[PDB]
Assembly symmetry: D2
């Protein structure tokens, strides 16, 4: 009784694909047989040991694992065998702090994070807290639902915290794995959608997915001015999904007075902010990643109802190191 897993033995060094023991579920735990497993840029930073707070090698990355509940520990009510579930970034949270009690468990200072501070989905099996798994709709293929668990909920919640309403303009900055999803959520939320990127093929994709205003930030000299023109003075919201220094600076020129910039990236270093302009223009800048368990259910319901579909590129657990190179739509590893 062993399983295949991609394991980070040491930071920076390529992951070894080893045969390890099948983790078993204690009380209050469950076991999931992973059918598909999405790859996020966060998994990259996990393997690099790049961030202030680091994993402890050896560990299995991955927080877009989806499959079937294969075993159920004692005490576990509700989640039964065969249940279709996903194991997202938020592995568990304390349940008693003011963040947890107020519907903001994503902020819990004692959370554990799947594929980071505990073993994740880059593997055939994973043990998880059933109180925090995502319940997946039956009508959506595993390869296709996997990205909702991080990219999808991230951009959905990101849009909610723009504080916009139907009829408003929202700018999606970056039409990659996160952004192509965000265009679809934004349309389903009744927003008029503008898209910004450096690649005309991605803007073409945004248009097909419902963006009605597009601008190429490399070939147009002043993309912020272009967006202000097309939105009568700027967008009420901007979601920045790929936070390069240029994208951030331009995002701040695209937002209308009183508007909100919502940031989803986890880039390194400091970025320059004109406090003068933020204050004069009454602008809000706000960070958001992932979402609460309720945000994730809501985000899954949009996929279930056909409003949101991820463009995916499929792969195998063995492609993990090449995948990470290609990174340096969404990649999902099919474990079938």
């Amino acid at each position: 009784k062993t399983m295949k897993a991609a394991v980070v033995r040491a930071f920076g060094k390529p992951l070894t694909i080893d045969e390890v023991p099948i983790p078993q579920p204690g009380p209050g735990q469950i076991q999931v047989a992973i059918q598909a497993s999405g790859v996020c840029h966060t998994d990259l930073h996990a393997a690099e040991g790049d961030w202030p707070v680091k994993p402890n090698p050896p560990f299995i990355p991955g927080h877009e694992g989806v499959g079937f509940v294969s075993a159920v520990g004692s005490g576990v009510k509700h989640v039964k065998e065969g249940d279709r579930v996903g194991i997202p970034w938020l592995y568990t949270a304390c349940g008693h702090c003011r963040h947890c009690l107020g519907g903001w468990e994503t902020l819990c200072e004692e959370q554990l994070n799947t594929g980071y501070s505990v073993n994740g989905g880059f593997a055939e099996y994973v043990v998880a807290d059933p109180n925090f798994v995502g319940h997946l709709p039956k009508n959506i293929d595993f390869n296709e639902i996997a990205p909702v668990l991080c990219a999808g909920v991230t951009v959905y919640k990101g849009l909610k915290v723009t504080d916009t309403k139907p009829g408003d303009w929202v700018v999606i900055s970056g039409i990659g794995g996160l952004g192509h999803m965000a265009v679809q959520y934004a349309r389903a939320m009744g927003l008029n959608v503008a898209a910004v990127d450096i690649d005309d093929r991605k803007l073409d994709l945004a248009r097909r997915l419902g963006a009605t205003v597009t601008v190429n930030a490399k070939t147009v000299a002043d993309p912020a001015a272009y967006i202000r023109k097309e939105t009568d003075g700027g967008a009420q919201g901007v979601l920045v999904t790929a936070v390069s220094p240029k994208a951030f600076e331009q995002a701040l020129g695209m937002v209308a007075r009183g508007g909100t910039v919502s940031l989803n990236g986890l880039p390194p270093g400091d970025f320059p902010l004109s406090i003068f302009n933020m204050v004069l223009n009454g602008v809000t800048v706000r960070g958001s990643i992932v979402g609460t368990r309720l945000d994730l259910q809501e985000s899954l319901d949009f996929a279930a109802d056909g409003k949101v579909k991820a463009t995916i590129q499929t792969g195998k657990l063995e492609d993990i190191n090449a995948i990470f190179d290609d990174m340096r739509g969404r990649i999902v590893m099919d474990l079938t």
Copy 2:
């Protein structure tokens, strides 16, 4: 036929106290006999020509002018001679844009600004738009009410946009002209208040005005860490009233996850922002200066009801250059000299 006025005739040069004609109110305008006139850092930036959009010299600064209506122009309703009014930063706004129609006239792209793009209250008389003046409470002396027109409304609105509630912790960063008023608004809004400054005197003022936690940012090893400990993981709101590089950095370390930093200053240059930390911690950073006509009325009511009282240093119109040097509580010129 003429009045005394402090005029900026050239950027960066001394203001002259000049005898200039008394502006007369046309249709839809009123005239105000100024009794007191507050001085703001914005006036200094107006006189220096520091900012990207500049005044057009010669002009009279001042957007904290308070006094009595002295003449009423054709067609003006309700306002009469003797009414107590102030002429704040927002001189007028278009009344038809989405910002104006939504009750956010402070954002109007066509606004004029008192003592910046039109003449202001550093003079014995001002012509104003009666739809935009502040209506002052009769029980508060002019010298004392003047600072509510810019400092008070700024920190009051700044606090409203921290998105906090009674019982939450808020930090007031900087206990100067703005900050000492912010302490009082914050306590009146049911907040628990922490104060941060670099001067123990200002911190003791904060305490007497209601702050139950104080920290000296220069004499403590890690002021942010100390604030987080005293507020059980950080403040739900942080109001930054004096925006130095260090105060901004420390402010971001003081906010709880999911919290909001409200910025009230107009410092030059760019400040470093860790997006990684903003995103991981779910933090909001928001700019807010002055406020709408309704924000100002609400701010004035707190003064009317004794909940907020400005500490003022009085001066004379003639002192205005000396006053600008001192700046390089609140300064208020008393025109009943």
Copy 3:
């Protein structure tokens, strides 16, 4: 010298079509040559004297009058002859009270109301306050746009104050002039829509406009119980646009715990409220009145962009009494708009 106008002379009696003087704009006013004029059930309530505060006959009803600016009074800025405008219920407001300053001018105690406390658009010309007219999208026909000036703006704002979010369920109660517009706004706002009425043709209209759940409250004893079943325990929002108090009473049973029932309809009298159920279930009931000038602009942009479209049949000013019979008897599909061209 004169124009044609439909005038209420006495409550409950037929309106007469009379030649009256053309109103002339004074300072700060405009005149509008009316091209189309929506018939709102408020005009009927005003013609019947249904409400505790009544108009003062003789008056011209109509607050869904749309057309071209035909003259401009002294001092008026921006508006010019030929501009496409509508004169809605909120004719004017004071501009200085706390409601007006804080984005809630629809609550202003000094407002005047078009076709009620001032003469309205059941006439060839209206004199208006240009500060409060709707500015109409040029790509939409007058007959089609007219209902947005009240039916549209009202249900748009009514939906905003349900405090719902995309993906939530909303129930529209009463699929008439307001209600058929409400189904469409709700769908454009990202809501799933249930519809309730007392006539299967109105439920069919709802379904064609995007409702995916329907129930007939005249044939089904407990419509609320069917709604709850079809929405997993109730809708997060309910908009009552109906003209019967019993609708209001039954709406309270359609909302999920923590949900909000938004009230637009204005039948006379009271409905019984179970305070017990409201408190146990954490329910909100909220009255919603037309919309602010900003709400109106937003609501017009939906019609401009093709996201909503009023279902209309045109009539003539002379037919107003037959139109009121039709309205009273529930034989209007959507809205009747009088065409004055």
Copy 4:
């Protein structure tokens, strides 16, 4: 082996003080040694079997029990023996529905209610779910903190859902067990407070607690008009703590346009609501009872900081039937004396 408990053996019959087994904590549970136990009108309605969904007799009422954790079942992290805790109305909730996941566990369709659907605190021990107990501030006596668990949290959350802000006027209708606490929470929330009741003595108490505007609804012919005059046009919020036909009708007359009436009682029957008035005035009427776990913690912190203090009258478990007669400020049975 056994314990004292007041047991409802049959609806509408006197409670029998019986000798019953001590409940034992299974896994995921704790046992609490009750020191004080507040009585609420809800306990009377439970005993009487008045409501559509009823208890299943025999049962022990009481959802304001406070005391010391006396044993801890297996699996229970965090909560320990000797911990100071209360067992409020919300005994448990499912933790997986949209209400529970959204921070609105008070609305959970699968909740159990202490002293109603499970045995409660009218006894020396109670078995509780540690995830849902209230953690009491160490500085407040048991008799004094008990009412916060229902009365206090009820009016606090009630006030939060008036959607008001500091400086607004709120009216507290009914100054009894709930309302005298409500006056104190409202003042601590920065509200200007008006009070309505039929008894000059309760209005005098409301004044001592911070209400500046008072009216006797029995001796003043038109109390709503009085309140409208005194609040310059109506209150932005009204909290109705005792919901009679007359108090409801008057509350709706006291609210400004766009204001909010928050209802805290569970009265029988139907109440007339004018549709025309609700719509033209843009009024909100909303129901609220008790609160979430977070709401309760917040309400407890106000008690801990001395901003809210319940007036209590003490009694004994054996008095319960006499207490209910008296019923048909807050009564708290002291189980130590």
